[PDB]
């Protein structure tokens, strides 16, 4: 079994092919607290131990570990998150080989050549031993690494002359990863990583607002509100203090404007790209402003209906 | 192995003969940035170090080194460019002897005798030591120099009486090299070099227009647009701002007219030539206006289908 | 009040005259993070808001905004930086008229005539409204623009015949600005701007080394190490990992050699200058190599003891 694991700070995305050749996808939010959870009734809890420390998957706790940083790539929580994603995917527990991911600036030196040091640090992290309480964990056999952003442009780069270049803008929870890549993947003009520019800018602001509105929860719940920002009834069902909905929506709106302006300023630093692609969960939030800011003709702008999965799908199309 | 290397500012042209006596040609655009490039996927990158400075072949970057000047003949970038051309030719890495080129006014004193000082400066440049990242470079053994322009007239000069004289007009990226040479190469009436009159006049203008049209790229991409100027669909695929194609084409057209007028005025300064030849990548742009301006009878006008290679082919026919 | 503001990417330099006619100078490093700072004890913090975004002056944070680019000339951060310089100058908050600066290639078209479009874009940037937290900002009334490099040669150009020409080499954090100007400022032979050739080449390399040496800081701290490169005790007090001082000094030394070679190659493109001047913070790093490379006689080489202020002083001597 070979499983493609785009292991992002916010969500693990999995893609893999079944025995009968059908392709499956699974997403798994990285919300874990440093304590075992308690099972009541029909609730199956996932309690893990790694290096003498206990964790549980907990989607609602305000004490869920905040994972919005570079260190997380090689962290213990990462290993828990990836095992948990495997254990909730529907695949039978087993040995597996995996292809995981690194941020551009971790995967590449300033010359756009692999940073074998960091690439190996990544592979070694998945050697850490982990226990699931009252159950068996998958065993992680062979580990290979790919860069983030770039693999998502695979299909599009195929029908692109080697003179054209595609700007792939990957906005995740922690990091803005930008790459400019020549047609047929014949070259890489430029990479760029900003690990202080993520949707967490918004997540963090929404989380604080929710707490003020007496809806104290995890980063995940805050993201859940960002995802449903356009649904006033959803907002009204989730947010406890009915009198403070505008505090959440406006806090969200201001951080979104900040997100936008910061992202657009970053684009000003690229030039000569003929095509523009926007991928990641953040794509939904910035795609209009990007298309507009780049004056790229409609046909040269690329945005899928499942932006969060663009990367892991590309990893699959390439490496499976 | 003896390789003929017309090492121009814009493109290295190579010609050499295989073991089984077949003649090969290779061209290699001189687009390099002072930074290593990043390999993603199946992209083989060429990262070099010369005198503690790093370079990569980069065809698209707007920061590619602009090489349109005389200094480049003896520069470090030249050495990188020549090694890169060798490494992309398909010849197995090795020792080689090479015959390279100098512009007329560098190769010759005012008396049309070799400028041994400059000729030696040229040979010594190729002694500079260079490293390819994760690979071996060719070793450059014996270096001999020839002048530009003149060698291209070799075949034609053969069937020409010693009384006739051939005007060889070499228009490159940086330099207009003109020579008037007597039949059987029995003499040189006159040389002329203008290093401020090149196709870069047009390249530069196209590059600026492309940037305004949000297609920020290298001089090479700009040349690529000049090469495909007659192909409206190519223009439409490459130029991002569909609303500003005329800005590129008109900027190109005006600089072309300037190129023409400047070249024609230069011709007025030669006299008594019985035959006219036009060589170089620039030949395509000026040949009609030349033929017309010189009132030379059709049979005495010389223009090949591969004008960019006329010189290196002549170097080969002469010295191989 | 009329204040001269050479607003560079790295440092704002201010010069202005007091009521009693005495001339004052102030420098202000452009180190700002996109977050308000926290005041503890006797620390006065400067927290600003511009267009719904928050900033603070922060000299040490590794997350200080990196401002080494052309866009910064018309950016929001620029406006914050200039207001902050005013607020730390010692001038009482007020209305002021200011004379600011543009890089040569922004201030001038290819013909060496004002680029009124860019010049107006510059003036309009300072119309952006900004708030200081718990305090009043200066109001910026009338704005006029001058080019960089040139104004610094004012005094020297005065005692220079109109036949002599002065090469003014302005090396800043982002840009190498070179101008060749005829005596009595009677003409401008040539301008040149390279916004990829700045001391940031070195700053960036020192910053990375400092991080490896567990002294993670801002670009400003890195510059602070470059300024004190000759002081081994300063280096030892600032750099935390005592075992890795050579990594910083050697990384600095290699980038300096790169800086030098790149600057010298640029000079090869000017000719006919009778006098050479070197200004800017970068002057300290390149002046020896310049003087040597240009073979200019000692008396015709110009270098002040306060190279960083040459330009703003010249703006003052001219326009006050
Ligand atoms: N449909 C949606 N609409 C709006 N926002 C969304 C949507 N789906 C996900 N997001 C946001 O996008 C973020 C997750 O993006 P994702 O691309 O999965 O990050 P990641 O890859 O896990 N993190 P990183 O390590 O930075 O790449 C969350 O913070 C969500 O708030
Ligand atoms: N088929 C073509 N049609 C029109 N222009 C062309 C064509 N091929 C090349 N060119 C132009 O010709 C230039 C390259 O000419 P080339 O003769 O290879 O220069 P070079 O020898 O490298 N430079 P120099 O050092 O001045 O001799 C480029 O700037 C192209 O824009
Ligand atoms: N005494 C010194 N010795 C060596 N380097 C210095 C010294 N003072 C300043 N510098 C360097 O010079 C740079 C600042 O130069 P400065 O001329 O103030 O740039 P700027 O005008 O703000 N930027 P630009 O927009 O490119 O003109 C810093 O990066 C410092 O590292
Ligand atoms: Mg991601
Ligand atoms: Mg040539
Ligand atoms: Mg400056």
CSV table of C-alpha atoms and ligand atoms in Angstrom, one decimal, chain B residues 6 8 13 148 170 172 311, ligand 5:
chain,number,residue,atom,x,y,z
B,6,UNK,CA,30.9,31.0,-31.9
B,8,UNK,CA,28.0,35.3,-29.0
B,13,UNK,CA,26.6,28.4,-31.4
B,148,UNK,CA,33.4,37.2,-36.3
B,170,UNK,CA,26.9,40.4,-39.3
B,172,UNK,CA,24.1,40.0,-33.6
B,311,UNK,CA,29.6,32.0,-38.8
D,5,LIG,MG1,27.5,36.8,-33.3
